[PDB]
Amino acid sequence: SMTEYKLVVVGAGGVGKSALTIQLIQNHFVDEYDPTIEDSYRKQVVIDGETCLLDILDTAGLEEYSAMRDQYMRTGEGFLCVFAINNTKSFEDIHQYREQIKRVKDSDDVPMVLVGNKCDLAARTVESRQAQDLARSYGIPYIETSAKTRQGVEDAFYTLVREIRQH
């Protein structure tokens, strides 16, 4: 009945895409690592006083499933591009996701948020200023999250919905 938003969570293996999604959907932290092939979760939420349906697609970071990107990139209406603050390679990998979204959408115009996850951990190897500068180079917001503490989780997903609403 209501408006549905197809949000897609992308990023390298192990950065916490599934944990972020389950913390949003079920208010629960998944401690174990079970690598994703693909999973979707639908939930009714209120954002800025307006009810809507989130359809969140949790995608594979493992390169063996990279062929599926084309499909979900075409129909995704907003993207969380997730890296982990203790994993510099996951930060380097962000650009590859953006470029594939460009090949199938013919632009990067799509709403996107750069998400630096695992900010509850003490040891960081991606500098905050480096992530802020990357997001600025893309013209998108940067949000620091922890799927463990729920810090920033609603802000990350709700920012996408706000950006879609304001097109």
Partner: protein, 78 residues
């Protein structure tokens, strides 16, 4: 790419990795429930092409001749 089955549930779908087709339907159900529901409501699996019939959870994936199933609460319908 590993083999996997598609499980359609009340609030989305899950792709469940399987090592081979000798896995039982019970194992697949348990994995699908744990991921989508977490930690007693009971569930069945149905072949996509055969609504309202529970698959035998003791049978193998290979015996189903199907790669897509619906996860349904036992007191409900797809």
């Amino acid at each position: 790419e590993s083999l996997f089955v598609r499980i359609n549930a009340a609030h989305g779908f899950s792709l469940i990795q399987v090592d081979n087709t000798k896995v039982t339907m019970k194992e697949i159900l348990l994995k699908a429930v744990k991921r989508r529901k977490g930690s007693g409501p009971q569930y069945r699996l149905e072949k996509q092409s055969e609504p309202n019939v529970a698959v035998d959870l003791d049978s193998t994936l290979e015996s189903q001749s199907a790669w897509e199933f619906c996860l349904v609460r036992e007191n409900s319908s797809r």
